[PDB]
Amino acid sequence: KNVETYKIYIFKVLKQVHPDIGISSKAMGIMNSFINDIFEKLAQESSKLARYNKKPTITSREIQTAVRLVLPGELAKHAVSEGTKAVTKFTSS
C-alpha cells in the first residue's frame, strides 16, 4: 500500500525558507508527526466547537476559533492572519 505523508510539501517549504539546507529522514519523520499532531488537535477542537453550538458543519470560522484556542499568543495571531489571507485569496479568485 502507498503511505501518505507530508514529506514533499515540507521539503518544498524548506526549500522556500532555506534554499541551501537539507533535511535528514529522521527530521522529516519528526516534522510529519508534528504536523499530524497539530492537524488532529485542531480537528478535534473544531469538532467540539461545532458540537457545542449544534451546527453540523465545520467552516473556516470554527477553524479560526480552534486556532485561537489551541495556539498560544503571537503564534496564534500569525496563524490566524495567514489563514485569513489564504481564504481571502481563494475566494477572490
Binding site: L49, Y52, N53, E62, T65, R68, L69
Partner: protein, 80 residues
C-alpha cells in the same frame, strides 16, 4: 475599573493559606499570590471570552467558563 487586584485583601490571602494548612506566612506572599492569581484569571477568562465570541454572544455564561476550565485540565462539577 482598574486596580481591583488590591481588592484581594491580605486577610483573604491569609484565610486561603490557612485553608491550605499553612502555619506562618511571609510578607511577600501577598504580592506573589496576587500575581499568580492574576495570571490564572487571565488565562481562564481569555479562553472563556473566546468561547463566548465564537457563539456570537455578548454575555459570558457559566458553560463558557466550565469549558475553558476543562480545556486546562481543571474540570469543575456543580455548574453544568
Amino acid at each position: 475599573l482598574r486596580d481591583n487586584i488590591q481588592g484581594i485583601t491580605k486577610p483573604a490571602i491569609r484565610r486561603l493559606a490557612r485553608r491550605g494548612g499553612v502555619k506562618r506566612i511571609s510578607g511577600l506572599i501577598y504580592e506573589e499570590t496576587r500575581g499568580v492569581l492574576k495570571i490564572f484569571l487571565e488565562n481562564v477568562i481569555r479562553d472563556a471570552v473566546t468561547y463566548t465570541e465564537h457563539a456570537r454572544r455578548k454575555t459570558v455564561t457559566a458553560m463558557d467558563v466550565v469549558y475553558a476550565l476543562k480545556r486546562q485540565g481543571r474540570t469543575l462539577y456543580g455548574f453544568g
